[PDB]
Design a protein around this ligand. Structure first.
Ligand SMILES: Cc1cn([C@H]2C[C@H](O)[C@@H](CO)O2)c(=O)[nH]c1=O
Ligand code: NI
Length: 330
């Protein structure tokens, strides 16, 4: 209102104190074309903005298994004061690290830790993007049979599954959803054989929600499509990032095309960047639970190769989810 007692601080003497941020990666690795890669692309974009480089202000620690989580979190505490655990599985390990290092800030992606001041929790309404993926799938199936390849049976993949089923049903409950789980997010070979089985049983679209396990689903659909007309190709739906690039193939009849129908987006990269900036400004949302949904565009659908009828069905379903008229289960 007034500030009579004041002093001028010359810009020459001012600085903003920076932070150093690292991600501890799950099984999938930073080359999973999906979840962990999204996080890493986000941390790199934050580094560029802050004039940093790899191992000079930001880095990743790749986890080899569940036992490596604690080791990687301890290593990260050496040089980094903002540490992301990327995946629900890191829940217990982040809890323990946050209690050893009360001076450092921790972020858990895809699960919730309560009552720890130095831990923020980030969740996505993956059911809402799953729903749109379901609507998209229903409006393009010829065989009225679609596949769902999950990674690890969990709260997180259950949201995608429930959402996807609800979304197919909202268009045509006739349509059969074959559900199979690979038991891993880093097992391409199991994805290949589950996809092979789902396509063989008459699925013409597979939603792969299995991280790097999903590379196998792409490899399978590529083989089937590489030995057929473009007319009769089978589709996969991408997850976490726009996966259009992974769907590039040549038909048997000479034609270059793409078998990625659509991708669910999960803006993990954006979350890493936005929270890294909050942390650096000394406004880290400790103890809070940040929920990203369709409303704030934290999840969305990329309508890559979808038909115009498909795009309209998705926009109408999105509208109804944003209204509150349609409630998506978990
Ligand atoms: C690749 C990967 C995915 N996921 C989860 C979150 C993703 O949104 C979903 C599908 O990529 O699987 C993990 O929990 N850990 C991983 O290592
Ligand atoms: Ni004074």
């Amino acid at each position: 209102s007034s500030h009579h007692h004041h002093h001028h601080m010359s810009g020459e003497n001012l600085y903003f104190q920076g932070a150093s941020a690292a991600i501890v990666t799950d099984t999938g690795g930073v080359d999973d074309k999906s979840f962990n890669q999204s996080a890493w692309e986000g941390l790199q974009a934050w580094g560029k903005e802050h004039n940093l480089s790899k191992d000079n202000g930001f880095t990743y620690f790749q986890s080899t298994s569940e036992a490596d989580y604690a080791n990687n979190l301890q290593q990260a505490a050496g040089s980094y004061n903002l540490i992301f655990g990327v995946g629900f599985a890191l829940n217990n390990a982040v809890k323990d690290a946050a209690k050893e290092h009360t001076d450092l800030n921790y972020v858990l992606i895809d699960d919730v830790i309560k009552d720890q001041k130095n831990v923020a929790s980030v969740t996505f309404a993956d059911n809402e993007s799953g729903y749109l993926a379901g609507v998209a799938a229903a409006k393009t199936t010829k065989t009225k049979q679609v596949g769902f390849v999950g990674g690890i049976e969990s709260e997180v993949i259950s949201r995608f599954e429930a959402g996807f089923k609800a979304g197919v049903a909202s268009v045509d409950p006739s349509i059969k959803v074959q559900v199979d789980y690979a038991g891993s997010f880093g097992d391409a070979a199991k994805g290949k054989t589950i996809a092979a089985a789902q396509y063989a049983a008459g699925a013409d679209i597979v939603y792969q929600v299995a991280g790097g396990t999903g590379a196998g689903v792409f490899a399978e659909a590529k083989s089937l499509n590489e030995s057929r007309p473009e007319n009769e190709k089978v589709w996969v739906i991408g997850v976490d990032r726009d996966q259009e690039a992974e769907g590039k193939y040549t038909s048997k009849d000479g034609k270059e095309s793409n078998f990625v129908l659509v991708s669910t987006l999960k803006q993990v990269g954006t979350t890493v960047k936005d929270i890294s900036n909050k942390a650096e400004r000394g406004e880290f949302p400790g103890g809070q639970v940040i929920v990203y949904s369709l409303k704030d565009k934290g999840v969305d659908l990329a309508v890559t190769n979808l038909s115009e009828e498909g795009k309209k069905a998705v926009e109408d379903a999105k509208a109804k989810i944003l209204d509150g008229s349609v409630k998506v289960p978990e």
